[PDB]
Amino acid sequence: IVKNGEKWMDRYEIDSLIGKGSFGQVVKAYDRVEQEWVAIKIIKNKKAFLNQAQIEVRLLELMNKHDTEMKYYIVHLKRHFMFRNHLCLVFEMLSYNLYDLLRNTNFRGVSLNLTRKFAQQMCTALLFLATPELSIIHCDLKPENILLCNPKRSAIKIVDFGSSCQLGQRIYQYIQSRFYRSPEVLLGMPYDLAIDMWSLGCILVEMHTGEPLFSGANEVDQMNKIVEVLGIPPAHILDQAPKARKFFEKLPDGTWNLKKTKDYKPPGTRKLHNILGVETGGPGGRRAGESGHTVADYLKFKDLILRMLDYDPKTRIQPYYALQHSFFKK
Ligand SMILES: c1cc(-c2ccc3occc3c2)cc(N2CCNCC2)n1
Ligand SMILES: [Cl-]
Ligand SMILES: [Cl-]
């Protein structure tokens, strides 16, 4: 749509394409007023993309009018305007995403110490979105949506509030990227902020092993891969779940098992203990003898992840309590 050297509103000089999406495109631009580079998210001129981006602008503006040390893990929206019938969101410039970070390790993962630093910023971000007056569900947490502030540094910010909604402003049943999709969403149940904590648990394991924890090819495969690690979801959850029978079957004695198709490891036998290599020098034993990667370090990480991957969104660890976990104690 947009040429390099193009000048908008005697303010912005467009340089280059940063990214393309369902929603439109993101470009690098020079702001002559502030005298800084910015990222401009240009929404497509179609009602559907416009209406959803208006919700994104509303939630970012809501976050901005809250001044607390907790808010500075979210990309800053500087302002927005309409141009040639496109909603345009101006953000601060950030660096490359955590998926690019994994790609750069040849998908062998970053250290437990860098994983910790990412976890602690992300838990702080989730604590900020849980502030009662905000109550924002991100709904699309994944490595691609977490950007470094600076290519030299390990500071991060969350981007893409394109799917985000406040608690009790739910639009879509089908949300989150499949690998990072919570059991409650797979099961068609009303969702709350706990779905972001599920995504986070998936993301932290992937950041350390280099590979997605649950890489389903579709929803049925997704649930099967979760069940391989965590077992059959509790009956009290399956009993209240509209889509339980997409994946499971109830029995005379009030018990649930998998529906099987044509030929997974038996439920709960692919142990997070072995995926992390807690007692076998980390993922593929590639951390054998490295400092900050002792069995004790690994066990604390395992405990925190299993609390983030509670099937029950009610008892799943919440951001404040995740920040108090031993994994973050020096
Ligand atoms: C909002 C803002 C940004 C964003 C902000 C600042 C940035 O500095 C460099 C790249 C970049 C992207 C990216 C997106 N994205 C939405 C579409 N999925 C991909 C990410 N949304
Ligand atoms: Cl990925
Ligand atoms: Cl989504």
Curated annotation (Swiss-Prot):
Reported effect, K41R: Abolished protein kinase activity
Domain Protein kinase intervals: 12-328
Modified-residue entries (Phosphothreonine), positions: T255
Residue numbers binding ATP: I18, G19, K20, G21, S22, F23, G24, Q25, V26, K41, F91, E92, M93, L94
Domains as described in the record: The polyhistidine repeats act as targeting signals to nuclear speckles. The histidine-rich domain (HRD) region is intrinsically disordered and promotes the formation of phase-separated liquid droplets that enhance its ability to phosphorylate the CTD (C-terminal domain) of the large subunit of RNA polymerase II (RNA Pol II).
Membership in a protein family: Belongs to the protein kinase superfamily. CMGC Ser/Thr protein kinase family. MNB/DYRK subfamily.
Disease: Intellectual developmental disorder, autosomal dominant 7: A disease characterized by primary microcephaly, severe intellectual disability without speech, anxious autistic behavior, and dysmorphic features, including bitemporal narrowing, deep-set eyes, large simple ears, and a pointed nasal tip. Intellectual disability is characterized by significantly below average general intellectual functioning associated with impairments in adaptive behavior and manifested during the developmental period.
Role this protein plays: Dual-specificity kinase which possesses both serine/threonine and tyrosine kinase activities. Plays an important role in double-strand breaks (DSBs) repair following DNA damage. Mechanistically, phosphorylates RNF169 and increases its ability to block accumulation of TP53BP1 at the DSB sites thereby promoting homologous recombination repair (HRR).
Protein's recorded name: Dual specificity tyrosine-phosphorylation-regulated kinase 1A
